[PDB]
Each structure stands twice: as C-alpha cells, then as structure tokens.
Amino acid sequence: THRFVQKVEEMVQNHMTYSLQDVGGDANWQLVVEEGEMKVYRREVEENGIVLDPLKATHAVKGVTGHEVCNYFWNVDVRNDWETTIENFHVVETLADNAIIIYQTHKRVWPASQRDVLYLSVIRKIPALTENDPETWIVCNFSVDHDSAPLNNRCVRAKINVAMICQTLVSPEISRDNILCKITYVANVNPGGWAPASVLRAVAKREYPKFLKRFTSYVQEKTAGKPILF
Template sequence: MSLCQPRPAESGYGSETSLRRHGSMLSLTSAASALSSTSTSSFKKGHRLREKLAEMETFRDILCRQVDTLQKYFDSCADAVSKDEFQRDRVEDDDDDFPTSARPDGEYNHNNNGSKEKLFSPASPKGINGIDFKGEAITFKATTAGILSTLSHCIELMVKREDSWQKRLDKELEKRRKVEDAYKSAVDELKKKSHYGGPDYEEGPNSLINEEEFFDAVEAALDRQDKIEEQSEKVRKPRLTLASPSDAYSTIGTHRFANKVEETVQNHMAYSIQEVGGDANWYYGDLKLLKVYRREVEENGIVLDPLKATHAVKGVTGHEVCHYFWDTAVRLDWETTIENFHVVEKLSDNAIIVYQTHKRVWPASQRDVLYLSAIRMIPPRNENEPDTWLVCNFSVDHDDAPPTNRCVRAKINVAMICQTLVSPPEGDKEISRDNIMCKINYIANVNPGGWAPASVLRAVAKREYPKFLKRFTSYVQEKTAGKPILF
C-alpha cells in the first residue's frame, strides 16, 4: 500500500476512543521530550558513552512502536478501501433495478447517501479513526531530534576521548624520542670510551669505524693532550744545559753509521735548502713567517707525503735551535707526543741511536720509532754564506730494539737545517739578540705504517706540524732569552 494515500473523512474522529488514543500519543510525545531533555542534561553531567548509546536504544524503540502503529493504520485503511469498492459495486448493481429521481434541472440524482454513510459509519474497521497524526508527528520530530542530539553528544565524547588518547600518544612519542636520543648518545659514548680493547674498532684492515669517526676520535684525543700539555707547562721547571764546543760537531765521526750519516747530510744540503719551485703537487700554507709545503704521495695505500716547512725566528741562532732539537736532556720539555724514550747506543759525541714510543691516539695503533740522530755544523763555502747547522734523524735497525707486536714501527727521515742571519748593529755596539735571526728549513719524510686512513693522516699532519714548529721555536726563544749568544 502507498503511504501517500489520502486519509478518508472520519465522522467519529472525536469519539471517546479517539480521545483516549490522542491522550496516549500526547503522553508518548511527552516521554520523548523528556528523554531529549534528559539526554542534554546527562551530557552536561558528563555521562559516559554507553549511557548515550542506551538513550539512543530508547529512541529506537519509540520509533519502532510508531512504525508498528502506522503500519496497522495503513493495513486498516487498505481493508476499508477494499470493502468500499465492493459495496460500491453492489450499490451500482442495485441502482440499475430502481428508477432515479430527476432534479428540477433535468439531471438524475442517484440516492447513494445511505451506502456512503454505511461505508464510513462508526462500524468501519477498528483503528482507522484512532490515529492522532498530529501527535504522531510531534512524537516523530521529538524522537529524531533526541537521536540527533544524543548522536552529537556521542561524537563530542568520541572527539574528547580521541583528543585524550592523542595527548597520551604524544607524551609516549616524546618519551620514546628521549629514550632513543639517550640510547644513541650512550652508544656513541660507548664507541668512544669502551672500545679501547676491541680490535674491531681500532686501526686495522677490517676496522668497523669509518674515516669520519676515526678522525673525530683522533682529534678529540689530540685536544685532550693539548690541554694536558698546557697545564704541565705552567708547573714545568726550566733546565739549564751547556752546549758542546762547535768543533766536536764539525767532524764526521768513525762509527759504523758514519758513511750513512754523511750521505744523508749531503742529500739534505743539496735538495732541502732549495726553494720550492713550480711543482703543482705541493700544498702551500702561509702562517706569517711559517710556511708549510706538502706533496701527496702514497705507496701501497700508505701515506708518504714529504713535507717541508720554512720558518724565521728572531733572537736565536741556528746553533741554539739545533742544539735544543738534538739534546735528549730537554727532549720532553718541548716534545709532547712522546710517551717514553731512551738512548740505545751512543755512537760518538754528535751521534746517538734513540728508541722512543709515541703516545697512543685511539683508535690509531701506538707507534714507535728507532732512529739515529746526528748533529753537524757545515762550514760556509764562501764569505757570503753563513754557518749551517743541521740535525738529521733517520731510521735504523738495532738488535737491542727489535719491532714488537705492541707498536707499529714507523720509519722517518727528518732534518732540521738552520742558518743564522746577522744584521750589523749601529756604530760600535755589540751584537744583541735583536740583531740575529734564524732561518729554518724543516724536512720530514715519515712512513707511519699500519692502516690509518689517508685522509686522517693528512688532516693530522696539517694540524700538528705547524703547531710543533711554533711550540718548539717558542721554547728555544724562552730558553735563550737573557743568555749569551751561542753562534
């Protein structure tokens, strides 16, 4: 049956039964309104979501009852229409047997009022006249409004609960981030501090530490050594040493390495004093009077970069600079990288064999070196040339200091070549330290051995060599200040 069928005229709509049903619908409407107001107040009181869902169940029951009522009504209407059509057909058949009365205007008037009155009399099917559509409409509106209101409250409760969970999630994520950062920091610190005994994190062919981490660790260790050195310089007591007569340094000597010493000295004098030419491979760095040149050379993956530095130091002579560089009695006063050393053999007054171990810079392996150190004075070839003082250190082998597994044996060929330049004083004044300057050529060819990354070795060399020369020359100036000049 269509829900849009027109409602037939009701003669008994205001009957007692209709009023009772009307009152029943009004009470149902009042209940729905009360539920709606209860829903609003309960939300204000902060009832839970389950209570809101229970209210929606109540509204659903109300709507179901309305649907059942309407369905009964439309079923009654359908039955009534069917009976109406059946009786109408019977009336028309009866009218064919009886004459119709004519109106004054000549038209026929079928007398069927009796049949209609009979069709829509109170004896019609029960339920047709007992529906209060106005009350049902009010109830329906109130119920749907209550459903929407409760649903809105449910959504608000869900949003609040979602916001609460989101805040908890944000807090947990923040805690997790802090824990991950702390864990990462702990792991990094563990790598820096706890792997000193782990071969996988030290210098070697299968090291797990990359070049960047290797360099950072080396640089941090060197910084710590610099701070220790600064503190030790404040409490260091000065040492007084006497230089040997210059004649003892001008002889070649008669020891078993005499020819090797002479060959090394001549090579340095022939090539090391020369100015660096247009070799494009040389690296140039200018630090006022200190200039550093380096050429990148590798052999079998090992860095062998030859280095040359030139420097000019005021107030000291070449003899003084070479003396402090060669004398082992003051070695630890200016050399901060040495852990310990001792003289293995004294070959002559101007030549010794020294074994020394250098402080370990983790994760690099510890290095040691065994070298012959000789000091020489080279007479000038003509009147215009100054005296030249030279200290050469080059690696040798000795039975009393064989290589060990504890250290990586490095090979060196180092020379400190110094010349004294004198500017004549005015008048008959004596030469003072203001009138002298030492021109220095420092040569270093070092094979570090081992497996240290090339980039790290070059970065350390760039940092340490200029610092070493400035520290050493400042030490010589400090030691010779106020003392007689030693030419």
C-alpha cells in the same frame, strides 16, 4: 768514527743538496698552512694505500741562532720540555758526542694503532761554501736497524727521515735583537702498517705547525738573556 759515519755523511749531504732548495716557485709543493714566516707545505703521496706525504716547512725565528736551535732540537735532555706527542723514549746507543740512536713511542691517535720509531740522530756544522755564504747547522734523524730494538707488541714501526736545517743572519756587541734564524724543516715519514688516510693527514696538519710554533718559542724562551752561541 762510529760505524755510521758514511751513512750520516750521505744523509746530511742529500739534505744540503735537495732539502734547502726553495719551494714557492715550485708548484709541486702544496702550501697547506701559513702563519707569518711559518709556511708548511706537503706533497700528497701514497704507497700501497699508505700515506707518505712529504712535509716541508720554513720559518724565521728572531733572537736565536741556528747553533742554538739545533742543540735544543738534538739534546735529549730537553726533549720532554717541548715534545708533546712522545709517550716514551730511550737512548739505545751513544755513537759519538754528536750522534745517538733513539727508540721512542708516540701517543696513540685513535683509531690507528700506536707507532714506534728507531732512528739515528746526528747534529752537524756545515762550514760556509764561500766566505760570502752562511754556515749552516743541521740535525738529521733517520731510521736505522739495531739489535737492541725493544719488543713493543702495541706498536707498528714507522720509518723517518727528518732534517732541521738552520742558517743564521745577523744585521750588525751583537744583540739578540739583531739575529734571525731561518729554518728549513723536512719530514718524510712512512707510518707502516695501515692507518686511515684521513687520520694521518689530520694528525700531520695539526701536529707539524703546533710543533714548530711550540719548539721555536721554547728556544726563544730558554735562550733569551743568555750569551749568544753562534
């Protein structure tokens, strides 16, 4: 029990309530890019001329579990292996074995100024609602304030609320051949400051599918031929 346990519970529960709902019957979501089971949706939203466009994606990854996907998403020691848009990151505070506060800077995308972020990152297991249902693994990354925040005069401070939500199906020794992880990934980013709307939309449209294809392939790569961590 650290000082964020209640805020964590609330963000996690809001994701479980709202973020998992199916979009596809929902015309409010624009399906922007499909590549197989990878589907990436946005809503076009701006506040005081700043693009906020909610991002929502689903995916189905053969051969890995939700537990594994989330550990790898969460574990700072493998970040450099799959991240391509980060210039620097620092762990600012360890809250618990499942929660940390991270400071990170993103590579500049010309001509906007550089962005930095300060966020709590927590990984959690949500037991099945009934023995009929899937257990779920979630990572939530959401912006928080911290006294130890770096001074970075190059950077505008972005605010994020991101969740990677994972459910695992097995069609039955259980083999990697028989496992499928369904991912829901949501990212609500306020970039701060101003940035050209066209720049923000082009960076999102390029970087989110790249990230999901890349990150998920990395998890397949690292886990293959290892005992399955359900």
